[PDB]
Amino acid sequence: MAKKTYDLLFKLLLIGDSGVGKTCVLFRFSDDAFNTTFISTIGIDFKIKTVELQGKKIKLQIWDTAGQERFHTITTSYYRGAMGIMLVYDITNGKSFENISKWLRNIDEHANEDVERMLLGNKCDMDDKRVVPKGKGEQIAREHGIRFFETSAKANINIEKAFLTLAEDILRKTP
Amino acid sequence: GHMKQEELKRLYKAQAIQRQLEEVEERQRASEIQGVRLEKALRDEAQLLQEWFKLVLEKNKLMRYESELLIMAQELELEDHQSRLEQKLREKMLKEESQKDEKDLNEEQEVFTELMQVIEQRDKLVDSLEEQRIREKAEDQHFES
Ligand SMILES: Nc1nc2c(ncn2[C@@H]2O[C@H](COP(=O)(O)OP(=O)(O)NP(=O)(O)O)[C@@H](O)[C@H]2O)c(=O)[nH]1
Ligand SMILES: [Mg+2]
């Protein structure tokens, strides 16, 4: 039979303030499309994307988090099982960037010790509304020694690269 | 009303899974009938016996995929139920808080509850596939030791 089977299962998590574009980032990675209508996430959700790295298929179970603080207590449940975590902020929203420090200590508080963190500056396609300088995004990522990407769910910038890099990070650390 | 895009996508997946499944079933048969033909012949024998090995390993592969296909069909139905629950929840959610009765709050809560359940059910199917995978890797290692 021609349709093969996956060889490993990775569980990822997307966290960030409501409206940073977590869902759109995932939908671009899953279905390669983009919708402009803001439909806020309810509770929690996840998608399946299987991708090939190092010659071995990897199934990605990517959990999508509701940014609204009414569901924050739910998301905290899913930190422990996560193998990779996406911190997503909005370059057009200064408040979403200052809350990054707060999100990070929710990670170290709950998630496993060997968890892979990654910072995503979404909506990088909006030059005229940019509030957070790219340099500031790399600065704080460097102080935590994590990776950083300025992404765009609309223009499809650094989305495929972002997820694939997080997976290759996880794959290298398993022996 | 006319069928929406996201439902149509789910539809083609389901149909495609059934086609794949039917191919598995017929392959499982064609190998069963061929299996009786090799068994009767024995009653170069020596190699005749490992074209039958090659078959046994392939028959094994078919069962593995069949198991995956059956679970795959269950996932889509849960995804279908999840969309319906999700739309039923946003309708209630958007209505003005000023005009919400306890009944309106309760039913809004029971759908949310029911919504989170199908998501937990979906997660169980994901784990189920992983538990099979680890069993078949274990078998594979021994089978090719
Ligand atoms: N221009 C632009 N808009 C984007 C981008 N990503 C998301 N958006 C828009 O920003 C809004 C929020 O997107 P969404 O993914 O729903 O945000 P979220 O992070 O899922 N929020 P929540 O936590 O409530 O579910 C939507 O209107 C969406 O179209 C992007 O890269 N570029
Ligand atoms: Mg969302």
Author numbering:
A (entry chain A): 1 to 175
B (entry chain B): 531 to 573, 582 to 683
What did the article's authors report about this structure?
One such family of effector proteins that was reported to link Rab proteins and the cytoskeleton is the Mical (molecules interacting with CasL) family. The results show that the domains probably constitute a Rab8-effector family involved in endosomal trafficking, and the Rab-binding specificity can be well explained from the 3-dimensional structures of complexes determined in this work.
In all structures (Rab1:Mical-cL, Rab8:Mical-cL and Rab10:Mical-cL) we found one Rab protein bound to one molecule of Mical-cL, in agreement with the previous observations that all Rab proteins tested bind only one site in Mical-cL. Most interactions were visible between the Rab proteins and α-helix 3 of Mical-cL with some additional contributing residues from α-helix 2, forming extensive contacts involving residues within switch I and II of the Rab proteins. In the Rab:Mical-cL structures, we observed extensive interaction of Mical-cL with RabSF1 (Tyr6, Asp7, Leu9, Lys11 in Rab10) and (less interactions) with RabSF2 (Asp31, Ser40 in Rab10). Accordingly, the sequence alignment of different Rab proteins shows strong conservation of the interacting amino acids within these motifs amongst Rab1 (Rab1a/b, Rab35) and Rab8 (Rab8a/b, Rab10, Rab13, Rab15) family members that interact with bMERB domains, but not for other Rab proteins (a comparative scheme of the residues involved in interactions in the different complexes is shown in Figure 5—figure supplement 1a). Interestingly, whereas Rab1 contains a glutamate near the N-terminus (Glu4), all Rab8 family members contain one or (in the case of Rab10) two lysine residues in this region that point towards a negatively charged patch in Mical-cL. In contrast to the main interacting helix α3, which adopts a similar position in all three structures, we observed slightly different orientations of the α-helices 1 and 2, adopting a position slightly further away from Rab1 compared to Rab8 and Rab10. (b) In all structures of Rab proteins in complex with Mical-cL, the N-termini of the Rab proteins point towards a negatively charged patch of Mical-cL (Rabs are shown in cartoon representation as above; the surface of Mical-cL is colored by charge, red – negative charge, blue – positive charge). The sequence of the N-terminal residues of each Rab protein is shown below the corresponding structure: Whereas Rab1 contains a negatively charged glutamate at position 4, Rab8 and Rab10 contain one or two lysine residues at position 3 or at position 3 and 4, respectively.
